Paper text:
The [name] [name] polymer is the main building unit of the intestinal mucus layers separating intestinal microbiota from the host epithelium. The [name] [name] is a large glycoprotein with a C-terminal domain similar to the MUC5AC and MUC5B mucins and the von Willebrand factor (VWF). The C-terminal part of [name] is made up by a VWD assembly, a series of VWC-domains and a C-terminal CK. A low-resolution image of the [name]-C closely related MUC5B C-terminal has been published, but currently no high-resolution information is available for the mucins or VWF. Here, we present a model of the C-terminal part of [name] ([name]-C) revealed by combining Cryo-EM and AlphaFold modeling which show an elongated dimer held together by covalent disulfide bonds in both ends.
Using Cryo-EM, it was possible to obtain structural information of [name]-C from the VWCN domain to the VWC3 domain at an average resolution of 3.4 Å. The [name]-C dimer model shows two regions: an N-terminus with a compact globular peptide chain and a C-terminal tail with the domains in tandem organized into a stalk that ends with the CK domain. The [name]-C homodimer globular region in the N-terminal end presents a C2 symmetry, whereas the C-terminal tail had a non-regular double and twisted stalk conformation. The VWC1 is followed by VWC’, a truncated VWC domain, VWC3 and VWC4 domains and the C-terminal end with a typical CK domain. Our structural information shows that there is no VWB domain, but rather a serial repetition of VWC domains, disturbed by the truncated VWC’ domain only containing the C-leaf part and the two disulfide bonds acting as a knot. Interestingly, for all domains in [name]-C the N-leaf subdomain mediates domain dimerization. The C-terminus of [name]-C shows high flexibility due to several bending points. These are located between each VWC domain and within the Cys-knuckle subdomain. During particle selection and 3D volume reconstruction, this flexibility made it impossible to extend the map beyond VWC3 of the fully glycosylated [name]-C. The Cryo-EM map loses intensity after the Cys-knuckle of VWC3.
Numbering used by the authors:
A (entry chain B), B (entry chain A): 4349 to 4354, 4375 to 4513, 4518 to 4613, 4637 to 4941
The structure:
Amino acid sequence: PPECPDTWWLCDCFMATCKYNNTVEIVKVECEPPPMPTCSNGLQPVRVEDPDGCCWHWECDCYCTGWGDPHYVTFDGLYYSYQGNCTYVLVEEISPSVDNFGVYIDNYHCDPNDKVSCPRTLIVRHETQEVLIKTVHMMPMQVQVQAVALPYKKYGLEVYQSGINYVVDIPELGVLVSYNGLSFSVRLPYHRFGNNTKGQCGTCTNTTSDDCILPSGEIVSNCEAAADQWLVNDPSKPHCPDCTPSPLCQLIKDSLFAQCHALVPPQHYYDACVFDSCFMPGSSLECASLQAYAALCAQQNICLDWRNHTHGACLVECPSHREYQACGPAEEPTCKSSSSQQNNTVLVEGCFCPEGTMNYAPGFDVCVKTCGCVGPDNVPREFGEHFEFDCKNCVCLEGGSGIICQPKRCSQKPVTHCVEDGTYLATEVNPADTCCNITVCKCNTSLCKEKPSVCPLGFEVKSKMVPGRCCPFYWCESKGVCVHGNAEYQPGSPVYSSKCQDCVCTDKVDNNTLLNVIACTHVPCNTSCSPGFELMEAPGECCKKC
Amino acid sequence: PPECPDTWWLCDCFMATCKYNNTVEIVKVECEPPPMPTCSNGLQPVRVEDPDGCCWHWECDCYCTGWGDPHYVTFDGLYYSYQGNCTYVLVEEISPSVDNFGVYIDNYHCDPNDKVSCPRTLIVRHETQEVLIKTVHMMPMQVQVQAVALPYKKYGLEVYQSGINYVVDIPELGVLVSYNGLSFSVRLPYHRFGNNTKGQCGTCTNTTSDDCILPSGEIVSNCEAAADQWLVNDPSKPHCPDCTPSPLCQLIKDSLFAQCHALVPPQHYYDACVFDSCFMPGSSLECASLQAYAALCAQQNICLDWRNHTHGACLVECPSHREYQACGPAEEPTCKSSSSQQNNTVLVEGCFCPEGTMNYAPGFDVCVKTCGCVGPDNVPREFGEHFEFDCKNCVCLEGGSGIICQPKRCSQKPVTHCVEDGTYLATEVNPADTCCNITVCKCNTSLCKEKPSVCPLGFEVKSKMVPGRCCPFYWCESKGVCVHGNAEYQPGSPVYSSKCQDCVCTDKVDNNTLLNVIACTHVPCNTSCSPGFELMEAPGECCKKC
Ligand SMILES: *[C@@H]1O[C@H](CO[C@@H]2O[C@@H](C)[C@@H](O)[C@@H](O)[C@@H]2O)[C@@H](O[C@@H]2O[C@H](CO)[C@@H](O[C@@H]3O[C@H](CO[C@H]4O[C@H](CO)[C@@H](O)[C@H](O)[C@@H]4O[C@@H]4O[C@H](CO)[C@@H](O[C@@H]5O[C@H](CO)[C@H](O)[C@H](O)[C@H]5O)[C@H](O)[C@H]4NC(C)=O)[C@@H](O)[C@H](O[C@H]4O[C@H](CO)[C@@H](O)[C@H](O)[C@@H]4O[C@@H]4O[C@H](CO)[C@@H](O[C@@H]5O[C@H](CO)[C@H](O)[C@H](O)[C@H]5O)[C@H](O)[C@H]4NC(C)=O)[C@@H]3O)[C@H](O)[C@H]2NC(C)=O)[C@H](O)[C@H]1NC(C)=O
Ligand SMILES: *[C@@H]1O[C@H](CO[C@@H]2O[C@@H](C)[C@@H](O)[C@@H](O)[C@@H]2O)[C@@H](O[C@@H]2O[C@H](CO)[C@@H](O[C@@H]3O[C@H](CO[C@H]4O[C@H](CO)[C@@H](O)[C@H](O)[C@@H]4O[C@@H]4O[C@H](CO)[C@@H](O[C@@H]5O[C@H](CO)[C@H](O)[C@H](O)[C@H]5O)[C@H](O)[C@H]4NC(C)=O)[C@@H](O)[C@H](O[C@H]4O[C@H](CO)[C@@H](O)[C@H](O)[C@@H]4O[C@@H]4O[C@H](CO)[C@@H](O[C@@H]5O[C@H](CO)[C@H](O)[C@H](O)[C@H]5O)[C@H](O)[C@H]4NC(C)=O)[C@@H]3O)[C@H](O)[C@H]2NC(C)=O)[C@H](O)[C@H]1NC(C)=O
Ligand SMILES: *[C@@H]1O[C@H](CO[C@@H]2O[C@@H](C)[C@@H](O)[C@@H](O)[C@@H]2O)[C@@H](O[C@@H]2O[C@H](CO)[C@@H](O[C@@H]3O[C@H](CO[C@H]4O[C@H](CO)[C@@H](O)[C@H](O)[C@@H]4O[C@@H]4O[C@H](CO)[C@@H](O[C@@H]5O[C@H](CO)[C@H](O)[C@H](O)[C@H]5O)[C@H](O)[C@H]4NC(C)=O)[C@@H](O)[C@H](O[C@H]4O[C@H](CO)[C@@H](O)[C@H](O)[C@@H]4O[C@@H]4O[C@H](CO)[C@@H](O[C@@H]5O[C@H](CO)[C@H](O)[C@H](O)[C@H]5O)[C@H](O)[C@H]4NC(C)=O)[C@@H]3O)[C@H](O)[C@H]2NC(C)=O)[C@H](O)[C@H]1NC(C)=O
Ligand SMILES: *[C@@H]1O[C@H](CO)[C@@H](O[C@@H]2O[C@H](CO)[C@@H](O[C@@H]3O[C@H](CO[C@H]4O[C@H](CO)[C@@H](O)[C@H](O)[C@@H]4O[C@@H]4O[C@H](CO)[C@@H](O[C@@H]5O[C@H](CO)[C@H](O)[C@H](O)[C@H]5O)[C@H](O)[C@H]4NC(C)=O)[C@@H](O)[C@H](O[C@H]4O[C@H](CO)[C@@H](O)[C@H](O)[C@@H]4O[C@@H]4O[C@H](CO)[C@@H](O[C@@H]5O[C@H](CO)[C@H](O)[C@H](O)[C@H]5O)[C@H](O)[C@H]4NC(C)=O)[C@@H]3O)[C@H](O)[C@H]2NC(C)=O)[C@H](O)[C@H]1NC(C)=O
Ligand SMILES: *[C@@H]1O[C@H](CO[C@@H]2O[C@@H](C)[C@@H](O)[C@@H](O)[C@@H]2O)[C@@H](O[C@@H]2O[C@H](CO)[C@@H](O[C@@H]3O[C@H](CO)[C@@H](O)[C@H](O)[C@@H]3O)[C@H](O)[C@H]2NC(C)=O)[C@H](O)[C@H]1NC(C)=O
Ligand SMILES: *[C@@H]1O[C@H](CO[C@@H]2O[C@@H](C)[C@@H](O)[C@@H](O)[C@@H]2O)[C@@H](O[C@@H]2O[C@H](CO)[C@@H](O[C@@H]3O[C@H](CO)[C@@H](O)[C@H](O)[C@@H]3O)[C@H](O)[C@H]2NC(C)=O)[C@H](O)[C@H]1NC(C)=O
Ligand SMILES: *[C@@H]1O[C@H](CO)[C@@H](O)[C@H](O)[C@H]1NC(C)=O
Ligand SMILES: *[C@@H]1O[C@H](CO)[C@@H](O)[C@H](O)[C@H]1NC(C)=O
Ligand SMILES: [Ca+2]
Ligand SMILES: [Ca+2]
């Protein structure tokens, strides 16, 4: 046919006006618009491709930032300071395109006035799920509808970490939210969200004039007052109502940030630093705006180290196994699956594993040189290594599931007999293996079956005492004295057996004699008298010289 | 330009002729060849697209199968039976396109005849890696260069399970190797491997005639004789040199397999079944060909349940928490990675978790209903559940890394020994606590001065003895039979304090006679002696009868 049998945008923008099916006037279409001048934000615009492959126009992203306690900068580079306590809406939608979508910021319900214990909580609602990021004295935690871990992904919503920031993103909508504990940033694409947002972050129109509107939809010159009207009522608390310039603030104007003076306007941050320093001196509150300026510069592909120059008073506090770096990868290379990924170009600050080692896997913190397995207890393991974890036999081997554990089945030789009286069979904690639980011939002294063996007065000590046996043996109660003197043999027993017996054995010490000194010196001898005749051996006679 | 400003193949499978730059002579080309009637395999050819998107030809995949001990069928539907005991090569490349690519079957080296646990062993060598798949009585094991786990993936080589088969594949080349313990299968694409393969599986030439070739490279008629010369050399074992047709084989021609009689040639398997039955009756060796026939039918998207009609003698044996299904998904759904639907749409046989439950994750075996966490000890866990795994406080919460564990931080008995002499601090692990040695007082009888109170006499027992303290309390060695007596108050000491006395001591107790049984008896008296008298009670005058 003279007109083409679809005269068409046939391919690769090869457009056409067909004279006939065979002979047509084909056309080719291409173009290139110059880089847009600016976006009332100083940030360089990006390239957005047409639906048609023919061309790409320049459009710049929507960026809202909030730092310090009161400091806000909207999507179009308008800056203002607002103070409040009740939770406030950050960004919402004018015409609902996504169900229950919104970003909110509770600034003081957690900590009113001074936010020293907890500065803010960030609420992100997307359809079914809501995420509340809150901070405490040492490290923030997040609650999803219940607490969760950091590397979270569910229903197109992802939460993770990057440098010193907690990032909540929706890839389908391209929404990025970064929380720091001292500031927050919201990043939105232009085409998806163009002139359809409202809240304290203003309207992403590329115009600074319409950057604040009331919920009704009016325009007010006093942009600070419009922020106070963006209050979200909730069940709890329904009764919502001379300066010497510190040199630190001078760091913005120094030559260190001279590279940042291009591609990023420094007027707002310097004024915020000066105001914070004059609010009260010597509180280390003026090195919070510097962090935001450095973060924005890094986002602008300009990485700088500045904290060195701050003479301390605010640094990073992360554990020993990590070292602080001003320029580092946004996504650290975990050993588990670094694989291949688009290396982005913006190096962010933070603290990472040392140069020699590297992180193990997402959700872990142990840095290792050559990674094998990591169990629930953070201890590095090598491939083909045998270690008794818990009460089991476990092995780290290459493949899936890592650790493989099997039961212990420890056994001991069962002995029931207990020979000594003290020995009594008792199963008890196996000392070597708390799990083996081996039984043992326990020892009770009370169960001593044999009894003390009484001995004669003569013996001294059975020596059985403290034998060290399960049953304590007993020493002999008797002792060495001339016991076997006479009759019932005891220590003196010098009964007068002789007609003139002396034998006064007084336990006189002698070999065997001590035990038995028969010191008998009878004197049965008879001595004459002047008239007592026949006195030789007469009854009861003793020597008598008379 | 009148000459086309590159008359050329226009993009999008179009073409052009050019006598004008815009007014050109446009063309477009395409086709639909009839499906190749057959491919000498009985298998339907697959659609292979050209480089450019213009046309799709019908080339049939290369499939090599071998079941039982001696049976083999080449890539082109040629069948032969070969018996051998040393390792043989299945497929290798005539022109080396991939470094160190090969498949080897080790037959009989591990089990010579009457396989005790390993019928054979597969060796798949690809570049730097080699994989050895071996079997034992109940589960196969794989060694990768040392042992590895089941879900293995490294350097473009992947090893996993599917139904009852172990699958080794290289996604870059499309090579598939399936092992079962009773058979094996090799699947190769045509374009990558055409007229470049050699070995026992033959030439994937699409002609049965050229399938068998000597290692030198000749053509011979008998495939079996050539197969014997495909032997590879290793340091190990370097010295390599009445039939009643059972109804089980008759199941092949039954109406159950009627769908398989088309689209799949059933002659070879039936002949193999008959020959195996004739080899020895009643040994359950004739239900291995049925398995391969059913597997090939299932590969053709035709699932059949047949083991129910075998009247036993060969079924599956997998643990109780899994039930056998003749038609199920090749890749079972696991909660960790539900991701997208499995469009495999071929229902391989095997055994899976029951319909109520679902498998937890790859590399795991526990079937669960609502998945939470699974630690090294295979126990299901719920979200927000607190347990005492190892000696730690651990929690299962949804997110990254699953289980979060922290130290027990066990408290201790604050005691200083104890005041009992003998006590020494033990700081021991109270059975009530676990992993918690706490200070405890350890009375030591060896470490006591029990101050034995030496009693002079008559004290039958001090009675300190054993009262419940570890100190060895003291009994008193003394006893009172004759505490009194001139002889140092010795017991049984009857001596005349006065020569005229008896003081009889029988050592008796009585009432205080235990202290003084001797008491005394007065012998003295004087009576009438010779006239003239004057005896005057002559001193020493004890009772006389003068
Ligand atoms: C950081 O920080 C720091 C501090 O400061 C602070 O901060 C800042 C930021 C600001 O703010 C301020 O203001 C504050 O205060 C700073 O500092 C600086 O540094 C630098 C560097 O370093 C320097 O310069 C240099 O240095 C060197 C050494 O270093 C050292 O020292 C220093 C001082 O001086 C310091 O600072 C540092 O830190 C260091 O320290 C050290 O450390 C070590 C360790 O590591 C140690 O060691 C130790 O000890 C012992 C000994 O050694 C043992 O044995 C061992 O070893 C260990 O243990 C040491 O001791 C320490 N030291 C000290 C003293 O401290 C030096 O040496 C030099 O000297 C030089 O000069 C001369 C003349 O010319 C010559 O003769 C010589 O030879 C030399 O040379 C040189 O070299 C160097 C090095 O390289 C250089 O430096 C550098 O370089 C580079 C290259 O590339 C670049 O250029 C840069 O820029 C630079 O700087 C130089 O330059 C050269 N020179 C020539 C021309 O030659 C010197 O001294 C400075 O001085 C400083 N200052 C201060 C103030 O201090 C920083 O800067 C920061 N950073 C950042 C990042 O920012
Ligand atoms: C040997 O070894 C051992 C150790 O070892 C262990 O154990 C064993 C069994 C096994 O198991 C193994 O294995 C292991 O390892 C030992 O044990 C120990 O001991 C200790 C010492 O002894 C103790 O502590 C303490 O003790 C005391 C005494 O003792 C006793 O007991 C025990 C237990 O507990 C035993 O064991 C022993 O043997 C003894 O026994 C007894 O004894 C008693 C005394 O003699 C007797 O009694 C008698 O009789 C009658 C009654 O019956 C009468 O009446 C009187 O009483 C007496 O005469 C008994 O009979 C027996 N039994 C048997 C069975 O034998 C104790 O006493 C103590 O306790 C107490 O105190 C406390 C304080 O605090 C309290 O609380 C409590 O309650 C009590 O009190 C009273 O007491 C009494 C007496 O005893 C009673 O009665 C009786 O008891 C018994 C016990 O057994 C039984 O029950 C009977 O039935 C009943 O009747 C009451 O009841 C009570 N109550 C009240 C009223 O209060 C403490 O106990 C420990 O404990 C132990 N442990 C164990 C576990 O056992 C052993 O000893 C050895 N042995 C030998 C011989 O050596
Ligand atoms: C209580 O307390 C007590 C005290 O008290 C006392 O005593 C008593 C009995 C009573 O009498 C009371 O009265 C008095 O007071 C105590 O005990 C003690 O202990 C301590 C500690 O242990 C000791 O120390 C030691 O020493 C030594 C010397 O000496 C010794 O020896 C001798 C002979 O020679 C003898 O005689 C003595 O006795 C002694 O012995 C001893 O003993 C103990 C007790 O028993 C013992 O302990 C214990 O034991 C048990 C059983 O029974 C078990 O065995 C346990 O385990 C243990 O612990 C000891 O052992 C023993 N020893 C001996 C020798 O015998 C020295 O020598 C020593 O040193 C050593 O040892 C140590 C540990 O112990 C160590 O550490 C060191 O190093 C050393 O080493 C040694 O070396 C030696 C030489 O060579 C040896 O020997 C020999 O060896 C061989 C091989 O080579 C073989 O075995 C043979 O058999 C052997 O003999 C050894 O063995 C080694 N050892 C080791 C392990 O190493 C120490 O220093 C003391 O002495 C004691 N004392 C007594 C007398 O006894 C307790 O203990 C307490 N507790 C409770 C019971 O409660
Ligand atoms: C792998 O193994 C498979 C199983 O063996 C095999 O599948 C089929 O195998 C059959 C048996 O081998 C095979 O049958 C053919 O038989 C021919 C001899 O008899 C035929 O020719 C005489 C006249 O010479 C004729 O009287 C008689 O009736 C037969 O007619 C033939 O019928 C064929 C089947 O319909 C037909 O092939 C079909 O062509 C279709 C075209 O749209 C379509 O592609 C179908 O898919 C295809 O099957 C064939 O064209 C026709 N011939 C004529 C002239 O009537 C053999 O000659 C023939 O071998 C040739 O074909 C196979 C592929 O089929 C080639 O591999 C092989 O190299 C031969 O190449 C052929 O060469 C002849 C001579 O030059 C060509 O004849 C010309 O045809 C022109 C029109 O197309 C024109 O008339 C010219 O004047 C003729 O000279 C012929 O076209 C060439 N074919 C091709 C495609 O190369 C074959 O053995 C059957 O064809 C096989 N079908 C397929 C594709 O599966 C499979 O082929 C094997 N594959 C490979 C890679 O080897
Ligand atoms: C990203 O991609 C690579 C670097 O790889 C990146 O960082 C790794 C640590 C991993 O995280 C990766 O997942 C991640 O993508 C770089 O692109 C270019 O790579 C080649 C090496 O393949 C560099 O060498 C160049 O090319 C050849 C050598 O292959 C030679 O001509 C020269 O050696 C030449 O230098 C190349 O330099 C590098 N690109 C640059 C900087 O020119 C790069 O870091 C980055 N590229 C992107 C994202 O475009
Ligand atoms: C034997 O002794 C017991 C007391 O127990 C003993 O006391 C010393 C002799 C010790 O050396 C040990 O041998 C032993 O511990 C007498 O039992 C009782 O004694 C008391 C005190 O004398 C009597 O009380 C008296 O009773 C009299 C009247 O009988 C009164 O006149 C006194 O004023 C006083 O109340 C008590 O009655 C008595 N009871 C008994 C059991 O008789 C025991 O009498 C005595 N027997 C002998 C052999 O004399
Ligand atoms: C294509 O165009 C030529 C020139 O007009 C004409 O002669 C021919 O018939 C056309 N063919 C078709 C299919 O329109
Ligand atoms: C170029 O295109 C025009 C319009 O179709 C045609 O008239 C002319 O002949 C073409 N050839 C030349 C001169 O490039
Ligand atoms: Ca605006
Ligand atoms: Ca062939």
